Amino acid sequence: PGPMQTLIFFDMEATGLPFSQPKVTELCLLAVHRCALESPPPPTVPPPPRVVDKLSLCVAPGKACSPAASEITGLSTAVLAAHGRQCFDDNLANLLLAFLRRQPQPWCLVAHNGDRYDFPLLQAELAMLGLTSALDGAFCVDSITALKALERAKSYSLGSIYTRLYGQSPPDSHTAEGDVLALLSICQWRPQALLRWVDAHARPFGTIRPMYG
Amino acid sequence: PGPMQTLIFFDMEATGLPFSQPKVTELCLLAVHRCALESPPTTVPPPPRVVDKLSLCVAPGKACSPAASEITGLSTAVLAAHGRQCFDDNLANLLLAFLRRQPQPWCLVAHNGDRYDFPLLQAELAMLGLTSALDGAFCVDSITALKALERASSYSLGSIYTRLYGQSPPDSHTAEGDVLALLSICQWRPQALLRWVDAHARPFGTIRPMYG
DNA sequence: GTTGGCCCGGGCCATC
DNA sequence: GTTGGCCCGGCCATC
């Protein structure tokens, strides 16, 4: 496995915490080519690359959001149904894959605390559709682990890292797209160091076990 | 047809003006359920909380004209540096699957769409042999719409935006920036726009391709 | 850097 | 509203 050709920054919102077997309510993928981070007065926050692919979607979960999640995310099952949202079905999996197929391979998903939430949860959704092997060619990285390594070479939530790095809070927190753009900014802090950490720790996604599947 | 259930605001960037047989370099679709326009929430309007957004860069067959690169900040060598792929079958299936997530009838909204975004998109699909893919959708030129809304009450995207809101829109001359600025404008009188679009939603299949 | 509809033959303008 | 893991018995971190 060589250098990752595309970094796909990734975040989801869901009906609750892992023990509740949550269902996806919102997702965002932002695919960035390696050269945007290998060869990017100066601003405090790095400007996102001009050439990006972005996909943001709301998802009808099969059940009610927990009250705490509705409060944090601004999404509820009833409102999603009012906007006619469809559930996490086969067409959505085909959509995700068609988006990824626009990106040079190898792919590396990047998600904040991904190993405990975003990655198992996506794998659960795909597993329930029998598409457990649809992302087997992909790689993934947890940006909390990466940022710990980069910083040491204290809270590590997305908000705390952003503010510690950039001295201000990111806009539109606790949305899938807002948290993805914030994550992009954090990873653009020392982009070279991050690319070398990703290349050395890119984990096959097929080894991510479903959260509840 | 009845009430359009989904307005998909739409902009593309490309290599040049219509005379040069331009090729798409960037596109953005932003689908908004009509209920986000009929009963909005409680000075630019905030976008709806619930939206679907697709934004992509495309490798064109040819070079970008010098002015188009200046305006858009895209060039054909740079798109190749980012390993962008051409307008192909997969991309056509991408757009169709994204539209499948939206309730029908669909209506595309595009600024000066009757003369650029719509025929350019139709031409790309026609070179792929896919000239009937998006024909179940409707389309509406927001210049025609906004002219009538101010009539009963320059028409470039920037001039409209500054007239209603007073400041310049951010990220102008990108596909997403243009779409987001278009959304904000269409949220000025969302009630009257919905009635307008419903009264003048035109089948996408009545649009002839820009070339080929 | 254009030119095909829109305003009101022809000049203006809007997409990139 | 917190489980399950980590930074080095406490206390986060994704919703």
Author numbering:
A (entry chain B): 8 to 47, 53 to 165, 175 to 234
B (entry chain A): 8 to 49, 56 to 166, 176 to 234
Publication passage describing the model:
TREX1 is a cytosolic DNA nuclease essential for regulation of cGAS-STING immune signaling. Human TREX1 is a 3′-to-5′ exonuclease composed of an N-terminal DNase catalytic domain (amino acids 1–242) and an unstructured C-terminus (amino acids 243–314) implicated in membrane targeting. Loss of TREX1 function results in accumulation of cytosolic DNA, inappropriate activation of cGAS-STING signaling, and severe autoimmunity. The overall structure of hTREX1 adopts the homodimeric conformation previously defined for mTREX1 with enzymatic active sites on opposite outer faces of the dimer.
To define how human-specific substitutions impact TREX1 DNA recognition, we next sought to determine the structure of human TREX1 in complex with dsDNA. Using the hyper-crystallizable hTREX1 variants Chi 4.1, Chi 5.1, and a previously described mutant K66R30, along with a panel of 4 DNA substrates (including 24-bp dsDNA, 23-nt L-form dsDNA, 22-nt Y-form dsDNA, 19-nt L-from dsDNA) from published mTREX1–DNA structures, we identified a diverse set of conditions that allowed the growth of hTREX1–DNA crystals. Interestingly, R164 only occurs in human and primate TREX1 sequences, suggesting that hTREX1–DNA recognition is controlled by distinct contacts not shared with lower mammalian TREX1 homologs. Notably, mutation of K160 is directly linked to autoimmune disease, demonstrating that this substitution is likely critical for hTREX1 function. Compared to wildtype hTREX1, hTREX1 R128H exhibited impaired protein–DNA complex formation. Additionally, the structure of hTREX1–DNA complex reveals 14 residues that specifically coordinate substrate DNA including two human residues K160 and R164 that make direct contact with the DNA 5′ end. Mutations to K160 and this hTREX1 surface have been implicated in dsDNA unwinding explaining how DNA 5′ end contacts modulate DNA exonuclease activity.
